[PDB]
């Protein structure tokens with residue numbers, strides 16, 4: 001044939017895409033802050049730049065639960081107990097939030113990011129059955145968790161609301177708010193155990209607290225950052241009584257993969273995935289291993305197409321260390337920043353599939369090509385082609401554009417523009433070998 005023709009059907013729609021992003025929690029933002037100004041700027045550019053970076057459109061921040069910044073802990077805005085939940089909470093704002101406020105202010109005001117997801121791993125220790133933000137335990141006052149010290153549920157809702165207000169008064173709007181992380185998992189770090197029933201119980205307290213607050217923008221409540229699709233899907237029954245009081249479902253890709261559509265009315269975000277203990281690799285493709293850029297391009301495809309995800313977040317953007325827990329390597333001694341091809345994989349999506357995009361049908365792929373298509377709010381149509389074979393001539397059309405452009409990521413290209421020859425509404429591209437290519441059709 002005269003290449004492979006991919007035809008986009010704008011009349012067949014699926015989920016909305018809210019975007020793509022990562023976190024700088026657990027003092028990864030502090031590691032970035034220690035770089036020379038040029039290293040700082042390069043780290044921020046590769047994460048958020050829509051011209052020379054991954055164009056990430058969501059930042060996930062931790063709402064620190066710890067009493068201090070020991071180790072990699074995130075200090076809380078209220079690290080000292082008031083003794084009783086009947087006493088006002090004592091807020092001790094540091095103007096920094098574990099250097100996440102600076103990353104957020106750069107994302108929003110330098111790079112145009114509009115989606116800021118703040119998620120607590122735990123309440124402060126004095127609000128919990130175990131008196132500690134680490135080693136699990138549950139919020140005092142929930143069903144099954146009566147504490148000698150009192151019922152701290154309203155206090156935790158006031159606390160989360162105050163955290164959003166500190167960000168607001170620092171000119172950052174938190175758009176989404178989570179109050180647990182991995183509620184099925186006890187860990188040696190910030191962790192807190194809620195059943196799905198307890199999550200619903202708390203949402204019924206947190207929703208009116210937010211709606212009655214003086215916040216300028218009322219953030220959408222999220223739940224529950226379970227460590228896999230399967231674990232989160234098991235919480236949806238109990239959450240269904242409060243579907244009027246939260247608006248985002250969140251889950252990771254650790255204990256199961258995002259390979260089916262959850263039964264919820266809400267958008268579903270895959271909010272953390274990584275090759276956490278794999279030895280550092282920057283490569284796009286070596287053999288299809290767990291850390292390679294190629295693998296992560298495909299992991300995103302699977303989450304969107306098979307998991308019905310509206311967003312995809314790698315665990316950490318930039319940090320130090322020699323595992324694939326993160327996309328961007330910091331060498332603290334050299335003061336340098338090196339993006340892996342996992343950074344470019346997520347950017348090969350995020351640069352072109354912007355917030356509000358609607359996934360749409362595309363036909364004509366077979367064999368070595370996996371394809372998806374997205375209609376942006378500006379009417380630009382982004383067609384993803386993941387090519388596991390040799391160079392593939394592809395034609396991209398609607399079932400009408402005035403111009404086209406194309407970019408590819410592979411072993412020698414980092415979201416590099418390639419030719420998109422444009423004739424009578426049809427873009428013709430050479431999709432490189434073992435690449436992810438995005439072809440964009442633009443209205444006038």
Ligand SMILES: CO[C@H]1[C@H](O)[C@@H](O)[C@@H](O[C@H]2[C@H](O[C@@H]3CO[C@@H](O[C@@H]4CO[C@@H](O)[C@H](O)[C@H]4O)[C@H](O)[C@H]3O)OC[C@@H](O)[C@@H]2O)O[C@@H]1C(=O)O
Pocket residue numbers: 026072181182189227252254255272276277315321323325326
């Ligand atoms: C080599 O050190 C790595 C660790 O391997 C890695 O876990 C991470 O540690 C962070 C930590 O992150 C976890 C990671 O994602 C979730 O937990 C996973 C769920 O699935 C299980 O099967 C895995 O074993 C879990 O790790 C969880 O929701 C995150 O919080 O966060 C706390 C930090 O204190 C800790 O450093 O990264 C390190 C590293 O990069 O050095």
Ligand SMILES: *[C@@H]1O[C@H](CO)[C@@H](O[C@@H]2O[C@H](CO)[C@@H](O[C@@H]3O[C@H](CO)[C@@H](O)[C@H](O)[C@@H]3O)[C@H](O)[C@H]2NC(C)=O)[C@H](O)[C@H]1NC(C)=O
Pocket residue numbers: 014015016261262264265266267268308310
């Ligand atoms: C893939 O995910 C999307 C969400 O990102 C799912 O969309 C949701 O679909 C349900 C069922 O159609 C929608 O429920 C309807 O909502 C309206 C209000 O807008 C309500 O009045 C109707 O009675 C109905 O309950 C839900 O709105 C919609 N959510 C969004 C955010 O669009 C979709 O169902 C998922 N796909 C699969 C195959 O599961």
